[PDB]
Amino acid sequence: MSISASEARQRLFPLIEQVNTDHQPVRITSRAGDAVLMSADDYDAWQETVYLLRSPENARRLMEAVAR
Amino acid sequence: MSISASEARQRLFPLIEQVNTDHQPVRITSRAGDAVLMSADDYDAWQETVYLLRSPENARRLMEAVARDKAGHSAFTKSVDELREM
Amino acid sequence: SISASEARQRLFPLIEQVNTDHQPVRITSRAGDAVLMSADDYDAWQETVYLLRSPENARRLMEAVARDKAGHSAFTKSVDELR
Amino acid sequence: SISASEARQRLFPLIEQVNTDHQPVRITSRAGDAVLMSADDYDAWQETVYLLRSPENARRLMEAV
């Protein structure tokens, strides 16, 4: 799962299945710059958690509630 | 709040009570420079959380665990709700 | 956001786009949903929170980014003053 | 870490250390535990986290030249 763009183009569909089951990023290569394909749920989860880390109480809340 | 080093020297027990009740940091101001007093549990919880965030997959797992139970839900919702206010 | 059919068609232009404006693209499909972002945003996100494990590293990152913008010329000047 | 009664005796040198060393100090006490850190370092930490919300800002943190 570090591949050329032209191959990522043909395999796009299984690559979407993979990213949703694996939850690892796929590094895509090109003359145009590299891209990462990742699952929407991993992306959302990461952006949401970094937003919540704005408030240091929030991590304590989250940690405390898990361990319940 | 924000107070001088000279009064914080006097009021250290009550500022630590405050910091671990209201969870708002206290700026202590002085000739040298200024400092911030906060709750240690807030501080450590933050660090350890960031330690676990090695990759987006870890963020997803942490969101799962929050999704597991009623305790996770309300903690999460409350945090979202504060964030909606500010 | 765009479908996977279309993302498959336009992948090459989407790869250059995502590295030009640096905005991620949401891709929906019957197989599931993905996002496509530049490898640079992705690495920068991961690395930057990893650095932030110690909150003290935030000041250090700001100082490094400022040294970066200032240039090699600011450092040569320091060298010269030290002599 | 240090007790709150040691920290009271030495609050000035402590505020100076924390600004010079750019490392926090843990304070343990009867009223619970607290962390003392440089105000500027606290502010940079809060600001950086705020910023990290976009993957664009993160990119500009990494590729700042």
Swiss-Prot record, chain D:
GO MF assignments: DNA binding
Keyword field: DNA-binding, Repressor, Toxin-antitoxin system, Transcription, Transcription regulation
Membrane-crossing residue ranges in chain numbering: none
Domain of life: Bacteria
Family stated for the protein in its record: Belongs to the phD/YefM antitoxin family.
Function: Antitoxin component of a type II toxin-antitoxin (TA) system. A probable antitoxin for the putative mRNA interferase RelK.
Record's subunit section: Homodimer.
The protein, known as: Antitoxin RelJ
Organism of this sequence: Mycobacterium tuberculosis (strain CDC 1551 / Oshkosh)
Lineage: Bacteria, Bacillati, Actinomycetota, Actinomycetes, Mycobacteriales
Recorded name of the encoding gene: relJ
Full-protein positions shown: 2 to 66 of 91
